[PDB]
Design a protein around this ligand. Structure first.
Ligand code: GTP
Ligand code: GTP
Ligand code: GTP
Ligand code: GTP
Lengths: 406, 406, 406, 406
């Protein structure tokens, strides 16, 4: 028997996702058409012997979260429960606080997945490596650039036994090119160190990386499993576009019916395109590489869509060019309008990928990044929105370049 | 019998007020301690013969608006009613749509006040000028700079009869140094041109300046009354600070009990300071010129407060310097933190006052302006927030300069 | 050009609909599968020359109402607008207040339909009778029992000219067996008397029956059109069951694809049954006469359903007998449970049909009527709910007979 | 060091409190002017050595609960924290689930108080009896009638050692006249049996009475402390009136400034009357025994008020007689109206006190009990509401006797 614990965040963790996280929680944001933790629930339900999927977070249970829970329980034939913490307890404090609900039924192991990662999720390879070695902590790690590794949690390991000897969460110097993927496999024995950490706080909030991983490294309890699959961290609102690109590439092997094909009565399609069946796309439109369309989306004639996410209810009128953008829920773009962003991907292999701070700014200047329209944003006709963030329920009247429209 | 129609906006008009308008409507924002339309209701209730005050807007009636209506009806001994439009009808369409509720009881005249202006409100002088001349439209106008007049509605008048011969709402060239103050006195006859405008739209939405004032100028129906009192337009979130400075100057003659004095068991006070009676200020704090404090505000020891608005529930810890800022509701500033903004007063007499567009930006760079903290914003200890806008329910961890923290 | 004004109510008018009106507005309650004003919008869109459908009420625009407006505009290829009044103005005050939006485009006539009636809606016969005679007011009337007519608005007419000579809204004595159906055809001239009524209130709230119909009767302005089709008034929560029965009978001629047929892999079906396509019904269930099933409804094996309405999301477990009941949204009925009500159809032709007051009671005793379960009501296994009203979000544990479970 | 755990319920437990629990949670309902758990927090803050007060329940944290938490932390100079469970875990499951937050700081003992009891709260006598004997469980028990004891949890004890030998929660036969008061004193050792109960459920939800108290009775771990003070159980909405009478009697010794006195410019006062300082009572009114008035309540001239609770914002017009009633928030009673109920105090000493079931009914007939008006209920002039329950936001037009007005 196996279990899966998906550590979704809370409303404070979604503030960096801010113009999209104003209407729906950041875990329920659709990357490549389905919500971002439905990829985790998909991959965990594919593992044989998986009995339960628990979601630990401090979101209050509202209608989108409970509707997603019912839909996931019906779709994947598995109990998907939401354990709500009484306070933000960190990444390890929710695992220690819900230890009786996690260890109920005595599982052999339980996965611990951070909800903001986009991975190919090699849970079966990781599980079998654990079934051979049977250590308390198993980490998923991937190789990164030497400049990019200072953004992520570096893992210094011994290559013979694959045992991590050092862990630094954000080192100022290069210590390792292997970074932590946010996918873990825990033995039941792994809830025994967390307790000790909790007792050291009493002589509540446990950070799993700083208090458990960095402190127990080199003592034979934490081990690494290295993969070469796709991996990304969805932190800001524009990172979901790169995660969408990766997931649409993954759909060529995983869900080939989800990608859209060339149809004689349909639109032109380049690259990997997801179109929802409820969405009505005009045949004169062309939908370029890495485009996701949601339900009830009207796409007019002559619409160019490239590297974009169009959320549900949005309307693009005729001859509208949308590049590197996220078009919010119910937000309408008028005719001959151009919604353009500059490509900015958070990949740990690109040397001049960006350094991914909380600040969207530099020297007063807003950095050129993905154009994000919030929900119910009205873009007028023949108006350019370039490199801009538009907050929800905004009606614009002129062109805006490199701004944050409050 | 006289009436007063205060044209409050709706949720779309308050988007430019965005980080403060996320919790309460822009009409109910407290400038100099009381909400911004309570100044209008104060000045209209002081006029003898004022029977009713109507508020026309397309806000939905929620608990702050109805609570304000009950409090204003109890305080000013007058019926204060809220007429909610079915759609945003512009500045004149709500006056024409509610013509039966405005003309009920057959009033002699009714004032029409835009809710976003800060004025000294000379309604008695304006009323008596109208009682001498009895024209359909009477405008309040003030003198402006030649560079600043292109931001406001310019009025070209004839100086003998005080009759406006030309009206342009935003001219690209200088046409006049007299600008429209957003205070009008309407005769019942003035609802007769608006009807004609409505019929010309059928062969709904009536803009009072573009469709009525500019079109009927020079035909003997619109007349001007010129004042020298205080006037300001509250459009962005930082303009409310300048309106607070003007209203606290007005309080020296109007409400001398509202300004705070030097008390031996109290804080040091420079200039005009409003402190709410519920607020607890430490005696080591000094509160500089043009400072407004709301209810339930804890101000620690050694706190410097200058040119600021501290909204209700906010906590400033010890040795905190706050200059040119608006501290939101329930937002906490830690010890030795510095919340600083750059003074940007929107007055039509200063030649290098700013040009007051929708964009807060220039050339990518955020313009140096008032620091605005949203509601429930936690500022950590020994952290500087300089020239920044922080959106609500944000917990910061480091210093931010010249940014918009989403 | 023709128009249609559907007078939906507000939240005060839906209080008599109380356990069902706690979640959705009373106009959007599904009778025979579609919402109750979608029957009016269906019948008005079938009339040739119908340009617009206006809904006048004092509900605040929330997500169900706006979602219905968008769905109706897409389905019926017609502008369906919602005009929200600033106050409850009665049945005629909303018609007089929105006279400029009603008469916009100069229509030949406009229908006025009360939203709570279930009719066969003979708008074409009524329109053609009006096109022959061209009087200001045309009423739809039907024949009733002599005892039942005291519940409805009686119309004393002259049979040669079909002109009403007397109108009493609720007479204590028998004056007429013709009652008002709540369907009217108005000429533009008919907005001229309403104005006079409004002026008599000033020397706002206009009741169309008491102030206009009873006062102008016999003066040649109000005329009657008599039909023999189906008619019912949906006032209480159990009246919607009888309206569902009538509409499912009407579906045999109007929408024959909406009624469910005998399928070899499907459930047994007696009488007129509506099943939503999303609903999953077990083949061992039998669904008796006048049964409506909503979307996402799981119906177990052996379920008897007769004369019932099962709202969306509800779950009936195995061997559950449900008779004369309304099962709310998401409400679950356990196995071998019996949810039973007593039939009490409100038709004006039955002599011992009930007298339809606000009180559900008599002499302390609750009257035997339709069993209503609110939303998210959990009925446990092997438990009888007989003649009872269960308020929403209630979890029961034992059998309840003839009660109101708060 | 001592702690206090107040087991507030959740939204399902407040359904029996239904017409009052529609607006505010049942723990925050004001009995004798202050909310019902503020009596518990008052009595726990009076105990020396009390460090923390924890509230365990499954209410979601909304604005009334957090506002009460901030007000209680400011008033009683104590940390008052709310621990929200992830699910309804019963009366013992929340104590076992939050065992690390309860035992944090290693307290000597912690009180466990059910939030629905009205007691005199003898925590110091109970604590000192525990400090002499040091047993895991200490119960508060009171003597009841032989007929009434079948409603409560009976305790069969040995009178020499005060050790309970038998516990039955609702016996069909008389077993004991000592009943459980819902006040407990727990040693840290008492969290050790609860764990065993939890493990027996795995081979979550722990009922403290059925699983722990009845099973461990007679084994030397549970002991009784008997008091003679006031005690009541607030289960239905009308039980709060009897708890208000008991607390106003307690105010003669505990808060003598809260009771209202005879004032020459004030109303006549019989018995124990609480009046809020914000409430304006006319001098011609007389306020009889056991009357509680909330803030902002306007009481007209000639108003008789006896055995009543008037919640905040309510308006009683002139010559209005209100007896045995609960007048909701913002609910207005017109002039010469009579709001009357039948006394129904659920005390365990009265032999013909009522048997206190979930059903408010008998044989179809509604039982004569306390008249409850919900929030914003408008009672018209000269109209009698007798023995009736009126659900919130209802506007009545005639007299109602012995009904539930939906
Ligand atoms: N339940 C719960 N989950 C949390 C909490 N804080 C963060 N998380 C989740 O834990 C995951 C990682 O949290 P972070 O603190 O941002 O760590 P990280 O920056 O992604 O770093 P790595 O895990 O090393 O890749 C995300 O999915 C968060 O949503 C918390 O307080 N409670
Ligand atoms: N009722 C109503 N009021 C409105 C509407 N639009 C704007 N207002 C109010 O009318 C006033 C002025 O509106 P604006 O269009 O922004 O005009 P302005 O820029 O202030 O220009 P001036 O009036 O010339 O000083 C403000 O108080 C708005 O809140 C509307 O659609 N309906
Ligand atoms: N817009 C609006 N509609 C209303 C108002 N009051 C009632 N209605 C609607 O008008 C219709 C009839 O209202 P009622 O006052 O209950 O009249 P009735 O009892 O149905 O009587 P008849 O029309 O003669 O059959 C219903 O559809 C109500 O929803 C109102 O104040 N404003
Ligand atoms: N935290 C929490 N508290 C609960 C729960 N269920 C009930 N309570 C509280 O526990 C107290 C008693 O609950 P009941 O089950 O109704 O027991 P009782 O009928 O009052 O019986 P006695 O305690 O013997 O007097 C009340 O204050 C409830 O609000 C729960 O699931 N979680």
């Amino acid at each position: 028997m196996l279990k899966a614990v998906i550590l979704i965040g809370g409303p404070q963790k979604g503030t960096r996702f801010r113009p999209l996280s104003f209407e729906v929680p950041k875990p329920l944001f659709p990357v490549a058409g389905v919500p971002m933790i439905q990829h985790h629930i998909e991959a965990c339900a594919q593992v044989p012997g998986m009995q339960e999927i628990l979601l630990i977070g401090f979101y209050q249970p509202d209608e989108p979260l409970t509707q997603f829970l019912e839909a996931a329980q019906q779709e994947f034939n598995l109990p998907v429960r939401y354990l709500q913490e009484f306070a933000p307890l960190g990444t390890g404090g929710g695992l220690y606080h819900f230890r009786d609900q996690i260890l109920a039924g005595s599982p052999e192991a339980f996965f611990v997945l951070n909800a903001d990662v986009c991975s190919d999720f090699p849970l079966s390879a990781m599980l079998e490596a654990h079934r051979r070695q049977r250590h308390p902590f198993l980490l998923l790690g991937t190789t990164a650039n030497r400049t990019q590794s200072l953004n992520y949690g570096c893992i210094v390991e011994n290559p013979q036994t694959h045992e991590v000897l050092h862990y630094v969460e954000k080192p100022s110097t290069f210590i390792s090119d292997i970074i932590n993927c946010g996918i873990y496999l825990f033995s039941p024995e792994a809830l025994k160190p967390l307790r000790d950490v909790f007792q050291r706080n009493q002589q509540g909030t446990i950070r799993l990386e700083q208090d458990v991983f960095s402190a127990l490294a080199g003592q034979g309890q934490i081990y690494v499993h290295l993969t070469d699959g796709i991996w990304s961290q969805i932190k800001s609102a524009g990172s979901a576009l790169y995660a969408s690109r990766l997931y649409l590439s993954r759909y060529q092997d995983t869900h080939p019916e989800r990608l859209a094909k060339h149809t004689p009565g349909g639109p032109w399609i380049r690259g990997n395109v997801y179109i929802h069946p409820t969405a009505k796309v005009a045949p004169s439109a062309v939908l370029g590489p890495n485009v996701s369309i949601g339900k009830g989306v009207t796409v007019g004639e002559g619409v160019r869509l490239r590297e974009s996410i169009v959320l549900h209810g949005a309307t693009l009128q005729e001859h509208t060019c949308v590049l590197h953008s996220i078009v919010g829920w119910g937000s309408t773009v008028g005719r001959w309008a151009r919604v353009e962003g500059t490509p900015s991907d958070p990949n740990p292999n690109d040397p001049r990928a960006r350094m991914d701070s909380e600040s969207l700014f530099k020297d007063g200047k807003l950095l050129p990044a993905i154009t994000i329209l919030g929900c119910r944003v009205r873009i007028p006709a023949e108006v350019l929105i370039l490199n801009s963030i538009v907050l929800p329920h905004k009606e614009l009247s002129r062109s805006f370049t490199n701004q944050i429209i409050l």
